[PDB]
Amino acid sequence: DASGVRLAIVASSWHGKICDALLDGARKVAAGCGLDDPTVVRVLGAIEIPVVAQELARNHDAVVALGVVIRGQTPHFDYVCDAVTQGLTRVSLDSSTPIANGVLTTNTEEQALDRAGLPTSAEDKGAQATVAALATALTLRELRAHS
Amino acid sequence: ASGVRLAIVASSWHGKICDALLDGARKVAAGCGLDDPTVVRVLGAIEIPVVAQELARNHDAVVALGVVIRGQTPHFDYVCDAVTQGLTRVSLDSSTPIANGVLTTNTEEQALDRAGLPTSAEDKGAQATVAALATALTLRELRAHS
Amino acid sequence: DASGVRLAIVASSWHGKICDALLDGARKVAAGCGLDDPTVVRVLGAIEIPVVAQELARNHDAVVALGVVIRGQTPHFDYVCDAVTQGLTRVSLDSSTPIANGVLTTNTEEQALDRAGLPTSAEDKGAQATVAALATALTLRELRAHS
Amino acid sequence: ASGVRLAIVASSWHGKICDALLDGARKVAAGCGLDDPTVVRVLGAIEIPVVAQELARNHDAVVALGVVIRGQTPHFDYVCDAVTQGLTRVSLDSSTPIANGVLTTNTEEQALDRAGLPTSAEDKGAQATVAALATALTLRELRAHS
Amino acid sequence: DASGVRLAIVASSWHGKICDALLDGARKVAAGCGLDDPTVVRVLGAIEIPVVAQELARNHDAVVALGVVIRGQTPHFDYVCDAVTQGLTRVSLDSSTPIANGVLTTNTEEQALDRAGLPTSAEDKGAQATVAALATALTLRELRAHS
Amino acid sequence: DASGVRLAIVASSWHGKICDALLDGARKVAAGCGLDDPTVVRVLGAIEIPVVAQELARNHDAVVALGVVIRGQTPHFDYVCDAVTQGLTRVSLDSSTPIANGVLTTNTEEQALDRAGLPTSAEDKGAQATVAALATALTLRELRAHS
Amino acid sequence: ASGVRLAIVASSWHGKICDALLDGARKVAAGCGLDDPTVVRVLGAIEIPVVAQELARNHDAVVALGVVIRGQTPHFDYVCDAVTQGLTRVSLDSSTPIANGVLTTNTEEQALDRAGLPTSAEDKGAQATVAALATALTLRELRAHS
Amino acid sequence: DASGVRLAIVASSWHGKICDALLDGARKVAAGCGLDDPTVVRVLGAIEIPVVAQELARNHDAVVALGVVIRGQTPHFDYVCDAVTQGLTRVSLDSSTPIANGVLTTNTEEQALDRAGLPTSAEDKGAQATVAALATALTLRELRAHS
Amino acid sequence: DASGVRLAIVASSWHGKICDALLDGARKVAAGCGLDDPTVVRVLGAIEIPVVAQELARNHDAVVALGVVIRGQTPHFDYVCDAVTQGLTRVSLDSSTPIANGVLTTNTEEQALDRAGLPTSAEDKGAQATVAALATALTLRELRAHS
Amino acid sequence: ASGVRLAIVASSWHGKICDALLDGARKVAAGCGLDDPTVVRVLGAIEIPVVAQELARNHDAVVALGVVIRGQTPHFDYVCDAVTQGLTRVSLDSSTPIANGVLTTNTEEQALDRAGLPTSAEDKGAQATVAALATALTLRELRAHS
């Protein structure tokens, strides 16, 4: 069910059509699980996600990070992806809070489209990440102090 | 090893392979005198470190189990980077062994060959449990007594 | 608008004409958003950015890092880029302040120029990074304590 | 306040007075919509902060209850110093309100008068619970939404 | 001139008439310095102040703590005052933000009234605390990174 | 019962007859509760206790601190007691481990003798502290991750 | 001592006395050949630690100057407690000497007698600057060099 | 014996003849225990001890703090003693190194002399502190990792 | 002359003949420098090294990490090596203690054998790592507080 | 730049090349009027960060010098990863510039060409010392002063 879980979702905006679709999947999983009012915040790019996730983790049980990084002509793809990976990992462990990674990292636009839960997509990593976030919050809840 | 407090956290992507790793881990534990390790499941490998962190608070050792198989994109690289960074940090923050039994393979056949099924060449779940327990016993002997 | 946010820009100096172009883009975004007088500091190379950005974060709501790293004949490109990624990421999370990454990391000079918002450039990553910094500061302000 | 996660840790020295403080705390909680706060008992006041620390990890607020009454020695001073230092540290480390309902009196009569028994002038357990809940709701409104 | 400084005021409520008087002096100082809308938060008792001050320090340049602790029949007064002192001191240094202590600690009510800036009072410590917060914030601004 | 609790006891040596009696009570409570082999370490004075307790807390579920401070002709009593209080409190919270305080702090030798569980003593604070330590370890065990 | 980077932060409560401590400190620094010390004023003694923290980032030593005189209430005690806790913390966080030239007296006569005016028995502003410089030199000698 | 332990002694200089007497006691214990060449550093006042002790703890197994604080006409005695207590305690726990407190805190000069191990002194707190430091280092060595 | 330095060696056991060869070279270096009894600890795999190195660093002036990682059929090699690198680097800096990296990371067995100081080997990285640890410990001793 | 306290730590693997980087660094420092920089040698590049950490306690800037050249195995990659992670951490922990003059090349010719010998196209030891000094001066200007 997961109805008492306090959920935040932060979604970057680069490749907005794809980002909006990941957000839609995340919000739909949340609503399906009895959460109609997750905290939803938008940032410009994937690199902006961790600092916002850090703020949200102070008062949520779980944060879903959503965005889309697609490789271009330069090495910059590598470093955007390294920053996000390093940042979200650090935020989760500093805050002892699940930070689910639904940031697509693809070689091509077609690969990102296929993973965003658009109408013809094979899958929706935004929805998947949201399941991960909720299930992990629930597990931590059962492990922690209650008596 | 009968006095050591063991936890095992196993992700669930590639479930049959995950369950096989957990079977090898549980059997090593029981053979060493531990019938009741703390066992927790998470969805994907990325979710392991935050749960391992909670478990390290009150266990002498934690075994991380899972299966990451390279797909069409670079996502594989980043999942594996996050697990590595995460487990390493948790071990040092907590001064507790966090054994890495998370398979990272290019193919399913490679993962199956490492999950200790009837035809597998090895069982990395079992190996990771031996590592966890041996390291906990080592730290026990190095630490404050008597 | 961003007229209340305190913005700092630290720009390295290797490939100076491109750095100055990035800085022009950054200042123009800042001025467009109501900020005529951002704190602007220069350093020699990209590796020198994080320690200065850390200092600026003590006193600013957002910092924009600008610079240009272009691949040469050795692996050193990789380790410069790694150091910058690692450092900017840490500084952001230690200080709970957006540190926007406008450090170009390209294979060729042509690619760097095409991303510095010169007249025939396809884009301006210095401008983009400043939008990122300011928008993230505004978001954090709304999330944080006010009455 | 029906969504706030409340914990109460109460020491046990001067048990009847401790139980009276806990009664006032529980009743405030239930009146505010919380029938099932996490409630834990410890022996003496010195033991409260380490338990409050554990509870702060997964509660929005913690109420510390207990009773320290001055005896023949300076020990009273040091028990109260440790509780004060401890609760203050835990609150700030965890960014969670830790309400102080630990009575520190010179006499038993003073403690009884503050435990919300039929003839008591006040109930510091109840007061501390109001403080905990009000502060949690305040921090909720100051923090990140929506 | 403190028009640019972001001021928060947190005031406890034990001895409410006196607390309100301190807050009145604080608000008047802020307004005189060009700040008509400081963030103002009320808490129950003085012991509740530091955790709220901690939250406010993340988003403000100065925080003013107001309240009134008067010695009763027990040693409890001493421990309330100890908690406030240790707490505000730690928050100031953790956050590198001035936390002005306008929390009255008196033996009697007459003493608290005389320090709350009512018509017949010798002084207003609410007002004094606010001057202290703002002046120290402006000092730190000068000392820190700017152009 | 408490038989799986890993217990350490550190006892200072100033006023050795009294210290030895506190240690005897602690060890007897431990044995009564099914622990025949607690880690037992001796230090010279009460000020030496916290650094040793810190080491022991790394691999025990609970530490009992035992010693005897009796006021003399100077203020030094105050500062010995402040150090021990500050140190043990910090060790408990750094290590998230109960550190039971069985350090006597008395005005007179007679008061310390009366609290050491010697034959004619009214009480034994070494035994009391050991109960506190074990009961708290057991409670934390029930609050922590088990599933 | 000419090479040491000195900062002085003085509060302003009892301004004439604070100015006298500052005069003593400045004279010592000039006597030891110091470059123009960084000098900052704050309102009250409680404001000193946070400004001393800023200054310790860029200086080899900081001298804290101020005057706290006991009044009718317990407030004196908490002002002094805050200054003591703060300065001590700042010194150890920054690994920098923070010399304490904050007078804490019962009377105005006692503070005047310690502020190094012509009829004063002592100048604690001067003393504090000597302590700051001596300690900075010692730490330089202890630390990494040729 | 203690011939392998690395000992440092930091002694303040207010009341110099008494400080030198404390230091004599410390060196004599150290030499008795096999250590002819402890690191010895002088500071001006007791308040200067903790920051120097912190430095010495990076490089030594034990540090002995020596000094003499005698009550005067004002409350300042109290705050000097508080600062020393607080600082030595923190340094010990940060560094996981025994920091022995041989700082006399007396009401009169007579009491200080009677505790400095001059010929007619009742005791020698400088010697006592060195026994404490060395014995605690040896205990910690046995508790810690060896094979 | 490293007779005074406290050396620990932690060696993993995957590729045991090669690990033993590295340890042989390490022990011979230590003995040649006047250290007949370094603390030696064995672990299973390279990933187990950093947590044990962390324990040893609390009680030693230098730690030597030995082991052998050889590339197999999967990417696992890369992550084992990443973990070792991140771990030892963090432990060195947290503990301010040299942690020498004598962990071989090769593509083939022949390469690992050639670096393990067997009769036909081009070099002994176990021996090299031990020189590195001891030399760096002696350097730090010179740089740190002494007389 | 005459007032800046400079430290240089150089590793010794490929000793002739390391000595050339050190020569360039020393020449820059002497050119900018620097007091005798603190100079320390370590064996390999991996040993640099811990010694740089010590030096950053007592200096305004540290220059890290060394030579890593790719060999037959992946070892080059992990040596460089360690140096990068370490220096970056040390700089931010100490809030001190740690300039990276550690060459990371595929060949000996590439390192020689970057070590500022007469036929060299570049001197990265010199470049690194300029970066260190320039950054120290900038931070001084940004920090607390008159």
Ligand SMILES: O=c1[nH]c(=O)c2c([nH]1)n(C[C@@H](O)[C@@H](O)[C@H](O)CO)c(=O)n2CCCOP(=O)(O)O
């Ligand atoms: O244990 C896992 N094994 C995997 O193989 C895997 C996992 N997990 N994940 C993602 C999870 O770790 C997941 O929880 C999300 O990142 C949400 O946090 C994944 O995205 N993968 C798939 C990697 C291949 O992805 P693709 O085929 O290139 O899209």
Ligand SMILES: O=c1[nH]c(=O)c2c([nH]1)n(C[C@@H](O)[C@@H](O)[C@H](O)CO)c(=O)n2CCCOP(=O)(O)O
């Ligand atoms: O602002 C305050 N002013 C006060 O005078 C006061 C306060 N607060 N408190 C308690 C609060 O701080 C309260 O919040 C609880 O401790 C719960 O955390 C108090 O208990 N007091 C009363 C002190 C005198 O107590 P007594 O008369 O000796 O019982």
Ligand SMILES: O=c1[nH]c(=O)c2c([nH]1)n(C[C@@H](O)[C@@H](O)[C@H](O)CO)c(=O)n2CCCOP(=O)(O)O
């Ligand atoms: O809640 C408490 N209330 C108390 O009155 C009290 C407590 N606790 N303690 C000790 C405990 O806090 C105890 O747990 C030990 O210190 C062990 O840690 C105590 O020693 N006291 C008694 C204070 C009076 O002591 P005395 O009469 O002067 O020996």
Ligand SMILES: O=c1[nH]c(=O)c2c([nH]1)n(C[C@@H](O)[C@@H](O)[C@H](O)CO)c(=O)n2CCCOP(=O)(O)O
């Ligand atoms: O020292 C080691 N050397 C190695 O070569 C090695 C090690 N260790 N490990 C794993 C261990 O580090 C192990 O302890 C587990 O990860 C459990 O923590 C390994 O899994 N390997 C093998 C790397 C090659 O794996 P594969 O052949 O690609 O499956």
Ligand SMILES: O=c1[nH]c(=O)c2c([nH]1)n(C[C@@H](O)[C@H](O)[C@H](O)CO)c(=O)n2CCCOP(=O)(O)O
């Ligand atoms: O979410 C994102 N997805 C992306 O694909 C992307 C992003 N972000 N960014 C930059 C931002 O992450 C960030 O806002 C910027 O660095 C400022 O901090 C960014 O530069 N890219 C492009 C990566 C490909 O770059 P190129 O095509 O090789 O120039």
Ligand SMILES: O=c1[nH]c(=O)c2c([nH]1)n(C[C@@H](O)[C@H](O)[C@H](O)CO)c(=O)n2CCCOP(=O)(O)O
């Ligand atoms: O356990 C203790 N009980 C004590 O009564 C005591 C102790 N210790 N100490 C000193 C030690 O705690 C400590 O070993 C010393 O300061 C060195 O660190 C110590 O100086 N005392 C005496 C307190 C009374 O002092 P005086 O009689 O006023 O000089």
Ligand SMILES: O=c1[nH]c(=O)c2c([nH]1)n(C[C@H](O)[C@@H](O)[C@H](O)CO)c(=O)n2CCCOP(=O)(O)O
């Ligand atoms: O070792 C010391 N022993 C002391 O007795 C002493 C010291 N030091 N100090 C000063 C303090 O240690 C000093 O170095 C500065 O305060 C710190 O910079 C002091 O001010 N005192 C004197 C305490 C009594 O002072 P009054 O007579 O009340 O002014």
Ligand SMILES: O=c1[nH]c(=O)c2c([nH]1)n(C[C@H](O)[C@@H](O)[C@H](O)CO)c(=O)n2CCCOP(=O)(O)O
């Ligand atoms: O902003 C920069 N852009 C760059 O392209 C660059 C920089 N900096 N650096 C040096 C680095 O930033 C420098 O300041 C020192 O390494 C740090 O002290 C560099 O060494 N590079 C060049 C990277 C390529 O070098 P090669 O041609 O492979 O030698």
Ligand SMILES: O=c1[nH]c(=O)c2c([nH]1)n(C[C@H](O)[C@H](O)[C@H](O)CO)c(=O)n2CCCOP(=O)(O)O
């Ligand atoms: O340097 C100071 N010396 C002092 O004597 C003093 C100071 N400061 N303060 C103010 C305090 O330092 C802060 O400015 C204030 O608490 C706001 O943070 C004060 O409130 N005092 C007054 C101490 C005596 O107070 P009563 O007369 O007992 O009310």
Ligand SMILES: O=c1[nH]c(=O)c2c([nH]1)n(C[C@H](O)[C@H](O)[C@H](O)CO)c(=O)n2CCCOP(=O)(O)O
């Ligand atoms: O400065 C260095 N430059 C280097 O090129 C180098 C170094 N150092 N090291 C040693 C390393 O820095 C440490 O000294 C060692 O790991 C012990 O800590 C090394 O092992 N190397 C060798 C790199 C090439 O290794 P292969 O030829 O692939 O075996």
Ligand SMILES: [K+]
């Ligand atoms: K959370």
Ligand SMILES: [K+]
């Ligand atoms: K979708």
Ligand SMILES: [K+]
């Ligand atoms: K553990």
Ligand SMILES: [K+]
């Ligand atoms: K299996």
Ligand SMILES: [K+]
């Ligand atoms: K900031």
Ligand SMILES: [K+]
């Ligand atoms: K541009």
